[PDB]
Amino acid sequence: SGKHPLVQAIENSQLKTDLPEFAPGDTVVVQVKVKEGDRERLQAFEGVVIAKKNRGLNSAFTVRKISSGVGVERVFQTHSPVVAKIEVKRRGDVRRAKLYYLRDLSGKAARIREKLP
RNA sequence: GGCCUUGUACACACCGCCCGUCACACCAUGGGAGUUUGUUGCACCAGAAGUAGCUAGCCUAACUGCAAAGAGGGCGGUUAC
Numbered sequence A: 001s002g003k004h005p006l007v008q009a010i011e012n013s014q015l016k017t018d019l020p021e022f023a024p025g026d027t028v029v030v031q032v033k034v035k036e037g038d039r040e041r042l043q044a045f046e047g048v049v050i051a052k053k054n055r056g057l058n059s060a061f062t063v064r065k066i067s068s069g070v071g072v073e074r075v076f077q078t079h080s081p082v083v084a085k086i087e088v089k090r091r092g093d094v095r096r097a098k099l100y101y102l103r104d105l106s107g108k109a110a111r112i113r114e115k116l117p
Numbered sequence B: 001g002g003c004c005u006u007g008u009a010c011a012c013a014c015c016g017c018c019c020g021u022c023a024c025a026c027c028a029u030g031g032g033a034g035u036u037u038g039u040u041g042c043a044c045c046a047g048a049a050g051u052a053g054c055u056a057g058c059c060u061a062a063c064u065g066c067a068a069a070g071a072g073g074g075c076g077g078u079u080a081c
Helices: A005-012 A100-104
Strands: A027-036 A039-053 A060-067 A070-077 A083-090
Touching (some): A039 A070
Antiparallel strands (some): A027 A039, A027 A083, A039 A060
């Protein structure tokens, strides 16, 4: 809430209200709307959350995965309608907010320990 | 020119035979800056399915228990090859 109240009201008018709770280090699945022609479908994007930005309607989060041997990252915008659904598969236990050190690790070295209840 | 003996790689029989360099043509081959294929010895990295061990996170028909539960099992995690 570092913006003017009018901007805050205009932004708050468009907030999603069913977002789950997740943190860096968690592995998540994102259902992404894909529209070609008149054809609509949901594509799954599963991976580790390596960064989270809490900025109200300007919130974002970065998901990293290994796809066919090639690392790929996507920075989703949390309140965008293209993000249909987010599910948390497993909760991770980490020591810092940003996990960029994972980019230089491969295989067993990049494993994230599960957070035990 | 004629007889005996002797040496000979000559027998078209010394107007014999025959060797090497240089020139011409053809063939196979050695060396050679490098270019390239296969295979292999060490050292390290990564590492599937599978097998062996550990683990106590989650889920659970046959057995025990009136029931909470227990035993057993499965999924997962983890190490070695």
